[PDB]
Design a protein around this nucleic acid. Structure first.
Ligand SMILES: [Mg+2]
Ligand SMILES: [Mg+2]
Ligand SMILES: [Mg+2]
Ligand SMILES: [Mg+2]
Ligand SMILES: [Mg+2]
Ligand SMILES: [Mg+2]
Ligand SMILES: [Mg+2]
Ligand SMILES: [Mg+2]
Ligand SMILES: [Mg+2]
Ligand SMILES: [Mg+2]
Ligand SMILES: [Mg+2]
Ligand SMILES: [Mg+2]
Ligand SMILES: [Mg+2]
Ligand SMILES: [Mg+2]
Ligand SMILES: [Mg+2]
Ligand SMILES: [Mg+2]
Ligand SMILES: [Mg+2]
Ligand SMILES: [Mg+2]
Ligand SMILES: [Mg+2]
Ligand SMILES: [Mg+2]
Ligand SMILES: [Mg+2]
Ligand SMILES: [Mg+2]
Ligand SMILES: [Mg+2]
Ligand SMILES: [Mg+2]
Ligand SMILES: [Mg+2]
Ligand SMILES: [Mg+2]
Ligand SMILES: [Mg+2]
Ligand SMILES: [Mg+2]
Ligand SMILES: [Mg+2]
Ligand SMILES: [Mg+2]
Ligand SMILES: [Mg+2]
Ligand SMILES: [Mg+2]
Ligand SMILES: [Mg+2]
Ligand SMILES: [Mg+2]
Ligand SMILES: [Mg+2]
Ligand SMILES: [Mg+2]
Ligand SMILES: [Mg+2]
Ligand SMILES: [Mg+2]
Ligand SMILES: [Mg+2]
Ligand SMILES: [Mg+2]
Ligand SMILES: [Mg+2]
Ligand SMILES: [Mg+2]
Ligand SMILES: [Mg+2]
Ligand SMILES: [Mg+2]
Ligand SMILES: [Mg+2]
Ligand SMILES: [Mg+2]
Ligand SMILES: [Mg+2]
Ligand SMILES: [Mg+2]
Ligand SMILES: [Mg+2]
Ligand SMILES: [Mg+2]
Ligand SMILES: [Mg+2]
Ligand SMILES: [Mg+2]
Ligand SMILES: [Mg+2]
Lengths: 155, 208
RNA sequence: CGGCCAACUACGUGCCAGCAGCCGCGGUAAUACGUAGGGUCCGAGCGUUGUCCGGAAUUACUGGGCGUAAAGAGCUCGUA
RNA sequence: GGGAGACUGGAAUUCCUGGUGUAGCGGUGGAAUGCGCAGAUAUCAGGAGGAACACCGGUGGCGAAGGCGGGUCUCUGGGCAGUAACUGACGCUGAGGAGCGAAAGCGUGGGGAGCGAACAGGAUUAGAUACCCUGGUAGUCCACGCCGUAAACGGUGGGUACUAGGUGUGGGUUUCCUUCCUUGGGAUCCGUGCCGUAGCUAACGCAUUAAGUACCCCGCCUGGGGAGUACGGCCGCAAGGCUAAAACUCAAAGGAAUUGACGGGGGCCCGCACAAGCGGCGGAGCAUGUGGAUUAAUUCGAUGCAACGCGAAGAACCUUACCUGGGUUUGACAUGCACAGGACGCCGGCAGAGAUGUCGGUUCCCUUGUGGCCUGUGUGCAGGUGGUGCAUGGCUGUCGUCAGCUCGUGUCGUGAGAUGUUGGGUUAAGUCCCGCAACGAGCGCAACCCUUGUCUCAUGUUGCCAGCACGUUAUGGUGGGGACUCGUGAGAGACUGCCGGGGUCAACUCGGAGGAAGGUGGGGAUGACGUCAAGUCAUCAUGCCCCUUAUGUCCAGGGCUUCACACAUGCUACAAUGGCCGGUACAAAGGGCUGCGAUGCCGUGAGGUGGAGCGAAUCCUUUCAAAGCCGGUCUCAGUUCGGAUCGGGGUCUGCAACUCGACCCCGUGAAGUCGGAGUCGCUAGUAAUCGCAGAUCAGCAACGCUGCGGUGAAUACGUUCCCG
RNA sequence: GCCCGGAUAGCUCAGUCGGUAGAGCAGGGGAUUGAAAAUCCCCGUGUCCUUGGUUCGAUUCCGAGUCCGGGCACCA
RNA sequence: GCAUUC
């Protein structure tokens, strides 16, 4: 990437739900190349969501995504030896990447016995705006707004 | 260890094996015998000037072809040297051999022999620059030779600090696989140690 | 008897013992140290030290210099 | 803006007085001392006072130099041109001497706004008598003296004449073109710049404003340091200035220019360099190498990157180079010469740890010349994993698979050298294009070779099985079949070749079509000129040195496996994306002869027994995997996680598993709860994770190494920051 | 000699209530560096001078001893 | 911002 941006690998469409959001979620759950295991973790979590909320799982997943996606972010820059947290806008694709990474990582830190339970409950809380992933988003914006003065670097 | 041996680099393409046989079970024994033969031959006709030894085997037949600059010393007119060598050969090998003592067409195109000639001059305390230029000129006059490189390294002139000098004329495309590179190496024996002579002779391109 | 500067090799010690006018030679392979063989230059002399001139156009009359190498007074006026 | 004196103008800083008005101001890379909240900063009005004069204003003017810029007035110095009215060589230079002489400093008396040595705090730092911040005294200013130094520089003394031009600009004269516009143009005199000849110079450069060609006068130099110092003297209020040595010491100290290297210089580009991500290491246990310490010995080598699962692709004996002890000497192993043989050599017995010793049986061919052999006794000599990789060859690492490194003949320079190789563009690339005092060439780059991805043709066993027959209690099992695979031979295919837009109608570039593949398709092999006195005398070889009753050589036992610690590379874990039990699916590559070994039977199992069949596309390595998928169970617990350690009982290899092998079964059940500062790998079939095979090898310390397939991510805005 | 105050980690210093031994530097092991230093991260180090007494218990509360800082040793 | 030495 000294010679310029590299191409993004095409993501397939999930056969059960028909969202590419879902297969992106399984690629974040994916450990050690065990895709089939990650697949059923995600399917199970969406079924647990469907039974607990009654409504369509992909719709609630998208809602939870929209409540955890960061719009504004901080990038650190050394300037005169002092280090300044610089507010930078998040491009749409990065927003969803960040949101999904946050959802899965906090689900791994949750207390419920199995990952299907932890992931479904984190998705449900984030749909309501209650979860740890939502707090992370709010803290990301809090640090951006506290550093609004350093936006003039525009790096 | 910067330069791949030129012969081995081209061994499947532009040059050929110096021994032809097939054995599965006898392979180890065949190699042992070959080692013994080539050590018996490389330390016998030293002043005859040997370029190649090819060993062919089948059943018990052991055909040894010795390529030499001048076969005169490798066969006395009474057959004396052929008989002496065949005697020690069959003794060592265990079977029957047919020394096919040949001769080289263009001694001065032959990198192994050019290396021997430079080495012997250095053994006779000839200035190394002289021997280098002599070999270069002789080889380049001959019709196939499109380029030559000669390198001598060691205590050159009996100095205490090792020098490595090389002279080059023409093209010597060591990286080109299809290029026909003839390589020779010889170790000159001197009061102060050993000095190594390497010769690369480019003779054109082979397409097969 | 290294180069100036005519005349080279072996052995013995290996940064030691020593050499040297200058540059520099001795650190277990020295044409430079010590000895030997050989060689070179001189010869009833040959070397060394001291002293003066030369080379030294390096006090330059013959025969040198002063932008940056050493060298134009900080600048004027004016007496011999 | 030449100097001197007097008077005077406005902007701004500071302070003061008074409004308005609050709680911050001020300062830095970031802060803090500091000023405020008792009314600051800010804003408005008035007053005081000192210093410097924005714009004009320039590589412009004036002055001997130092120097000289608000305005006005007064007094006063110099310069230049025109006219030749006047004097008639009155000129030039000048040892000494005299005068002027930036800034700092000194004396006396004033003044003191701002600035600011010293001096305080604050910060930074290991320290910070500094740089940065807040304050702040002499001084900076005036009057009159003193001082007499500066890179007081054009580092270039003054006067005069001469020696191509071109082009700016300041001050005068004049001719023409004519509007008479006038920076119109010419000539001429006097300044001040730039560029360039000739000539000069070591070079850099100077070049009518000389560092050129010459004449007159002055000053000054004579290797670097000691030293512009001491002593003496003169001058000064002082500081100090001026004049000015020697002893002693060094073989140089210097000027200019050249090629490199380097920079906390610049420009332009790269690389998992960073950033964005994903998984690790540093914490625990164990394996392995190393340091250190032990030891009789713990053989030797490697020991920043580029030593440390490295030489070792295989240390119980052997290996083995080490230690202890026992033996042995032309030797464990060669070959030439003397001197005696007739045998050597086997196979057994006993003694010994074995080496070995001894005793019984066995035992030679041509032909008399010997021969092969040794009884053997000597003598040359063998033999050293003894030393020096800083005497070496060969082989290797490394920068770096980076794009660079050079030569021939011209040309430029006194020369080292330069040019080519720079410049503009472009590329992964010194790749190519366009220029171009260069024109070409060589080693590198690229390609040729291997492997992987597609198709065509040829061909059917041991491989394949579609279409036809015959068998299964099992399978291409079997008759057979070329049709699909596959194997291996030959060939086609990728060329920026084609189309559209960029472009020097150039390189090359961005996109599209077609195609299995697109832009060196992916990955191997391939390491230029050199560098590190890199590594290796222990693979081998080798100069020189050393040992020869040992530093050679045979053997038994021990060691290389030590252990209070430390480092490095790994493996297994800390669990539920998991552990355990049951069922079931899908590989590639490779290996096999005193070897791989199937069935069956016996063992819980390692394994035993026995041996079918295979030198193998045939047979064995199950019909070859694990992760995976389905089901059940455990339920967040130091546990049904973990599997270290230790007790008991076994198997196999081997003469032999005490030191010191692997594996199996029963029991045991340690640390470990995701690891401090810090640090490593990776850009797609990659990382992560899962098994399989091979070399070495009787057996294995293999978790190592080399290789094979299975499942398969995330992220890369970008070049500010770190490394190369 | 009299009157005070001392005496704690390798060094310089806190602590005291009768139930403690803590700071800075040094030292030791990591990390950073080509290598030192500086810096960063984990560690170790005490008859609390000696001495007896009180107390369930003494660095601590008493008396004594040794060593060391302070203020005094004067008038004829 | 800071960055001493061989
Ligand atoms: Mg001579
Ligand atoms: Mg003279
Ligand atoms: Mg003299
Ligand atoms: Mg001179
Ligand atoms: Mg002069
Ligand atoms: Mg000078
Ligand atoms: Mg002057
Ligand atoms: Mg005045
Ligand atoms: Mg006020
Ligand atoms: Mg105010
Ligand atoms: Mg004068
Ligand atoms: Mg004078
Ligand atoms: Mg002054
Ligand atoms: Mg004073
Ligand atoms: Mg004064
Ligand atoms: Mg005063
Ligand atoms: Mg200040
Ligand atoms: Mg004066
Ligand atoms: Mg002066
Ligand atoms: Mg000046
Ligand atoms: Mg001067
Ligand atoms: Mg002059
Ligand atoms: Mg002029
Ligand atoms: Mg000029
Ligand atoms: Mg000159
Ligand atoms: Mg001096
Ligand atoms: Mg003086
Ligand atoms: Mg004096
Ligand atoms: Mg990173
Ligand atoms: Mg570790
Ligand atoms: Mg760890
Ligand atoms: Mg070792
Ligand atoms: Mg390794
Ligand atoms: Mg052993
Ligand atoms: Mg070396
Ligand atoms: Mg070494
Ligand atoms: Mg060049
Ligand atoms: Mg170059
Ligand atoms: Mg060019
Ligand atoms: Mg090229
Ligand atoms: Mg290539
Ligand atoms: Mg070395
Ligand atoms: Mg040796
Ligand atoms: Mg042994
Ligand atoms: Mg070992
Ligand atoms: Mg378990
Ligand atoms: Mg525990
Ligand atoms: Mg737990
Ligand atoms: Mg890459
Ligand atoms: Mg094995
Ligand atoms: Mg793999
Ligand atoms: Mg008294
Ligand atoms: Mg020092």
């Amino acid at each position: 990437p000294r010679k310029g941006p590299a191409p993004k690998r095409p993501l397939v469409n999930d056969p059960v739900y028909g969202s590419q959001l879902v297969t992106q979620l399984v690629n974040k759950v994916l450990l050690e190349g065990k895709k089939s295991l990650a697949e059923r973790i995600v399917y199970g979590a969406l079924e647990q969501a469907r039974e607990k909320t009654g409504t369509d799982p992909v719709v609630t997943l998208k809602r939870a995504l929209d409540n955890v996606k960061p719009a504004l972010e901080v990038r650190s820059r050394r300037v005169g030896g002092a280090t300044y947290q610089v507010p930078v806008e998040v491009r749409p694709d990065r927003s969803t990447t960040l949101a999904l990474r946050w959802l899965v990582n906090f689900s791994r830190q949750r207390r419920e016995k199995t990952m299907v339970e932890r992931l479904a409950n984190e998705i449900l809380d984030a749909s309501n705006g209650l979860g740890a992933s939502v707090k992370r988003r709010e803290d990301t914006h809090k640090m951006a707004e506290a550093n609004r003065a350093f936006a003039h670097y525009r790096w | 260890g910067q330069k791949i041996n030129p012969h081995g680099f081209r061994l499947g393409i532009t040059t050929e094996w110096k021994s032809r046989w097939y054995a599965d079970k006898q392979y180890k024994d065949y190699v042992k015998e070959d080692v013994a033969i080539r050590k018996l031959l490389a330390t016998g006709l030293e002043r005859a000037g040997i370029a190649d030894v090819e060993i062919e085997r089948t059943r018990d037949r052991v055909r040894v072809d010795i390529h030499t600059a001048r076969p005169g010393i490798v066969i006395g007119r009474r057959g004396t040297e052929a008989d002496r060598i065949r005697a020690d050969l069959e003794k060592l090998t265990g079977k029957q051999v047919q020394l096919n003592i040949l001769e080289v067409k263009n001694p001065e195109s032959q990198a192994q022999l050019v290396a021997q000639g430079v080495a012997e001059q250095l053994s006779n305390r000839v200035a190394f620059r002289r021997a280098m230029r002599k070999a270069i000129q002789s080889a380049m006059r001959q019709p196939n030779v499109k380029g030559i490189r000669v390198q001598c390294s060691g205590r050159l002139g009996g100095a205490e600090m090792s020098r490595s000098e090389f002279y080059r004329e023409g093209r010597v495309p060591l990286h080109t696989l299809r290029a026909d590179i003839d390589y020779g190496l010889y170790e000159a024996k001197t009061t102060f140690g050993r000095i190594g002579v390497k010769v690369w002779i480019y003779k054109g391109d082979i397409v097969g």
